[PDB]
Design a protein around this motif. Structure first.
Motif, short mmCIF file in Angstrom:
data_model
loop_
_atom_site.label_atom_id
_atom_site.label_comp_id
_atom_site.label_asym_id
_atom_site.label_seq_id
_atom_site.Cartn_x
_atom_site.Cartn_y
_atom_site.Cartn_z
N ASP A 108 0.85 -1.18 0.00
CA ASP A 108 0.00 0.00 0.00
C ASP A 108 0.89 1.24 0.00
N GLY A 110 0.04 4.05 -0.63
CA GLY A 110 -0.66 5.13 0.03
C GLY A 110 -1.35 6.17 -0.84
N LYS A 186 0.23 8.22 2.74
CA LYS A 186 -0.59 7.72 3.84
C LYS A 186 -1.31 6.42 3.48
N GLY A 187 -0.98 5.35 4.19
CA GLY A 187 -1.64 4.07 3.94
C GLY A 187 -3.11 4.13 4.27
N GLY A 188 -3.92 3.38 3.53
CA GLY A 188 -5.36 3.33 3.78
C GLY A 188 -5.70 2.74 5.15
N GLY A 189 -4.95 1.73 5.57
CA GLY A 189 -5.22 1.07 6.84
C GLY A 189 -5.11 1.97 8.05
N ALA A 191 -5.04 5.32 7.74
CA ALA A 191 -6.02 6.38 7.49
C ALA A 191 -7.39 6.01 8.10
N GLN B 198 -16.01 5.57 9.80
CA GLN B 198 -15.05 4.84 8.98
C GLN B 198 -15.75 3.61 8.40
N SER B 238 -8.90 11.75 3.11
CA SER B 238 -8.52 11.61 4.51
C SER B 238 -9.72 12.01 5.35
N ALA B 239 -9.71 11.61 6.62
CA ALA B 239 -10.76 11.98 7.56
C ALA B 239 -10.93 13.50 7.65
N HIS B 307 -9.30 6.02 -1.31
CA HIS B 307 -8.32 4.94 -1.36
C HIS B 307 -9.13 3.62 -1.39
N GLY B 308 -8.70 2.63 -2.17
CA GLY B 308 -9.42 1.35 -2.23
C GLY B 308 -9.72 0.73 -0.85
N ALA B 309 -8.80 0.90 0.10
CA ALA B 309 -8.96 0.33 1.44
C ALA B 309 -9.87 1.14 2.38
N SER B 310 -10.31 2.31 1.92
CA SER B 310 -10.93 3.30 2.81
C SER B 310 -12.29 3.78 2.34
#
Ligand code: SF4
Ligand code: SF4
Lengths: 531, 532
Positions: A108, A110, A186-189, A191, B198, B238-239, B307-310
């Motif tokens: 990742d 980021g 910034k990594g998604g995890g 974040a 989240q 981002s948040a 982001h794909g993870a978020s």
């Protein structure tokens, strides 16, 4: 009676405490001039491209000393658990591979974030966002990084942007004639482990605040690859201001703030409560991912002013992929924070054959308790968020669970690009919890009996595994480069190639380390520390 | 193959759709020059002081047309409940009082927030923050507003700053030679209803998103003085970026964004899901504070890249004190958004309760009526909110008794703005009840706070407390601070804790003070169905 007081009053506003290297010949991109009696700086905007490109390249191969020292501390501390030392050693070896400048430290790579501070008399031509984005585009396109940004075509239809854009570009107007930056990959995890709480005056006493901290740290769990840099922000002039502050705190951007408040409401770091956060972290037993003392590297606590009716609170972490770089442009050229290029100086199981019918693998796994360290050899099927969603939708239309969800353990991951001549790009796990809603359903339909990722998972997954005879294996989180280099032998795209890194993959692995986190009997190795 | 795409692409970046007035003679503060072949603008920083002073004065007496239209809609809609119409009428009348320029529309005159966008070649001398703060300082010092900011001397020791500083100053570097602004006077109550979730890809389908929206809107409750402008942001880099965006969306700052996405990940407003938010809000039955259709004025929904993870998600409101002003400085001088100076054009059964009796007689009378009953209060209120409650609890923890003045009268949670010369009271509306929930059972068990008066739904512990102790919670209309001061509040005296500011304990005498019985002494709660 009027007195102006800035909220943030760092004693080191220009980060003199940081070491910088000058980009060779970069004095040719700048020219000091004098206009209407004041000193100004002409900056060729190509300098922004050059700088962003170097920053978002370098940052994936090197770390800061306070990060590396943390891992060394976890290895040398007598009070560290065996699992603390194993994870920390693995991450440091990963950093050593990454410093070879081919594989990024994490798969990742980021979201690209730029905090920029352009002086009143710093003149760029004004197209800063485009030139910064071009440099970012360059970094992710011409290096072995990953395209992680997901565009919304409408509310639900999505596609990968294919270049890791857009970036988050926060360009501020400030005094003077220089241009100063903090770049964050910034990594998604991590974040995702940025939390906002809306609290009250009832929180603001030692007993209540302490209990609050104990409660919330556990909700961080192990899902963002600890040891954590933990940041806590109490107060703020708005939710978004509180969350910006906790982000920057986690990047150690506010380290030189005062340590006392005043009647004008200035921000301050609170070393006493930083110590209390660290004590809670150590005594939690959560450890560096698998139980122990090193849940956290260090802590930052910033107290902010607040509206009488309000008390926003922010909590956030920087993860094992701790990636930020300070920089500035001035009359002498382009300066960029120097990271540690020699991480090696900081350095002082049950074999599981996957090449069997999966029921045989389940049987072997059933013989062991949670917490058992395993070494996997053979085929993994790789799938994460969008593939799971697509597969659920297929089954909802009466189609079967695909065969590839039934033959092998499911590795939740998305790879970075493969370097020329390499078997794999960086290829570590993504967070298990995001797939929790699929496990019972898939198992009920004869698949996903064995999953492999990182992070604690919810109770529905424990119940599912007990009901269906399933298992959840926790990979070490973070060591994406050494996994790619030593463990991953073959990579093939199996389905949904349009999803890019989120496609379904079939990979062949050797000596792939993991822990049994959830078994087939209702047990969870996190049930004591993360209850 | 490189293509730059800004996340935000408004079709109206300079807000031409907004009406502006020029500050007379203000062209004297600017001068056009040319250096290195480029046009620049020298701006006397005094302009920033002048502009910030006017913005943070005007915004407390006038509203935007879309806010006022919403109140009119709540009155004229056949589908509005009787309580919808009553609340909206009260807020419109409050606005008419505020337009007289003496009393602010709400007692909570808010946090001063500045979003500023300074052009590359806009030259101020660079002391923008100080000059803007001086203008803010002027507005709150020389007008009948309130000092609402709380400084931390250490982690737990606090004091009021006494001037409503510090401000939130977000000054951005942008192209050009002008200076553009959004000023927000943000109430604490609606600031508290800004939420970050989240979430994941599992959320992103019609069924899941709809259920999510249903669930979260109820958690807003009535504690930020609805009808709401509701903003929802799905996604973000981002948040903090998600939360900034949901704030600006609630101020209608992003109204001219495109309405479709693209492969470059640009932001867009989503009208279809805005309609769904409004349907959920309307069908909720929560209404304009006391049951009905007008939970919300309008909705804004912005879809962002992720982001794909978020998948960060932001939910926030603008409350009845809907207070923002656009402005810009250019070669012609200082321009400021024109608000509606004549709100009156938008303007198209209760139990009398004598508080000048033993409080046990008042409890007896209240016990005769069901939740939802309208009352009119006459007599003495003891006023105390967050810090006074904390101090009194601290006293009791040190073995001291609950002070007698907490037992003699109903407790009004409020903090007044400054009193205008010749007035009995400055603006003096209610504070959110929920923040005091942890004190009620304790105080009632020691023979006090049997009757409380504030706004917003409260937690189950308060319902249980009132049933156990024979207590009541009365809901004031939330928002109408100016008309309450002008018409209902007859006398104000400080009783205890003078060192606190607006947060001291007050004794006030009121007449014809309207409220609803929200919690009774029998386990009933008029919000138990809509906010379940
Ligand atoms: S180290 Fe872990 S949390 Fe951080 S970016 Fe990599 S996978 Fe995500
Ligand atoms: S209108 Fe209500 S929520 Fe808004 S500032 Fe005033 S009291 Fe607070």
């Amino acid at each position: 009676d009027f007195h102006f007081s800035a909220i943030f009053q760092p004693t080191d506003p220009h980060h003199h405490q940081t070491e910088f290297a000058k980009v060779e010949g970069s004095e040719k991109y700048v020219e000091e001039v004098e206009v209407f009696g004041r000193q100004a700086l002409k900056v060729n905007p190509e300098a922004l491209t050059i700088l962003a490109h170097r920053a978002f390249s370098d940052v994936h191969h090197f770390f800061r000393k306070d990060h590396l020292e943390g891992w060394r501390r976890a290895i040398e501390d007598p009070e560290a658990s065996d699992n603390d030392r194993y994870v920390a050693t693995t991450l440091l070896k990963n950093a050593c591979i990454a410093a070879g400048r081919v594989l990024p430290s994490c798969q990742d790579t980021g979201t690209a974030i730029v905090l920029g501070k352009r002086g009143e008399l710093c003149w760029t031509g004004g197209e800063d966002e485009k030139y910064l984005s071009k440099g970012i585009w360059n970094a992710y396109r011409y290096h072995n990084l990953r395209y992680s940004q997901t565009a919304a075509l409408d509310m639900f239809k999505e596609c990968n942007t294919g270049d890791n854009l857009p970036a988050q570009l926060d360009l501020l107007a400030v005094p003077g004639s220089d241009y100063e930056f903090l770049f964050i990959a910034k990594g998604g995890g991590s974040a995702n482990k940025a939390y906002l709480y809306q609290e009250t005056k009832a929180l603001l006493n030692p007993k209540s605040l302490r209990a609050f901290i104990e409660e919330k740290l556990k909700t961080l769990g192990t899902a963002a690859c600890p040891p954590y840099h933990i940041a806590l922000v109490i107060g703020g002039t708005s939710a978004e201001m509180t969350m910006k502050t906790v982000k920057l705190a986690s990047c150690r951007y506010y380290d030189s703030l005062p340590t006392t408040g005043d009647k004008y409401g200035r921000a301050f770091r609170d070393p006493e409560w930083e110590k209390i956060v660290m004590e809670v972290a150590q005594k939690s037993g959560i450890g560096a991912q698998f139980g122990g003392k090193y849940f956290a590297h260090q802590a930052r606590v910033i107290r902010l002013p607040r509206h009488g009716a309000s008390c926003p609170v922010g909590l956030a972490v920087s993860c094992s992929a701790d990636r930020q770089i300070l920089a500035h442009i001035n009359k002498s050229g382009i300066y960029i924070e120097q990271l540690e290029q020699n991480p090696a100086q900081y350095l002082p199981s049950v074999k599981v054959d996957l090449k069997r019918p999966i029921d045989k693998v389940r049987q072997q796994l059933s013989q062991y308790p949670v917490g058992t360290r395993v070494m996997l050899n053979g085929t993994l099927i790789v799938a994460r968020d969008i593939a799971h969603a697509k597969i659920k939708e297929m089954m909802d239309n009466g189609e079967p669970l695909p065969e590839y969800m039934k033959t092998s353990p499911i590795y939740y991951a998305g790879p970075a690009k493969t370097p020329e001549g390499y078997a794999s790009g960086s290829f570590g796990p993504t967070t298990a919890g995001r797939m929790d809603s699929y496990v019972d359903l898939f198992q009920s339909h004869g698949g996903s009996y064995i999953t492999l990722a990182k992070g604690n998972r919810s109770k529905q997954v424990t119940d599912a595994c007990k009901k269906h005879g399933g298992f959840y294996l926790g990979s070490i989180g973070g060591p994406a480069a050494i996994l790619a280099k030593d463990s991953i032998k073959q990579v093939t795209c199996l389905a949904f190639p349009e999803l890019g890194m989120e496609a379904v993959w079939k990979i062949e692995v050797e000596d792939f380390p993991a822990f049994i986190v959830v078994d087939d009997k209702g047990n969870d190795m996190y049930s004591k520390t993360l209850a």
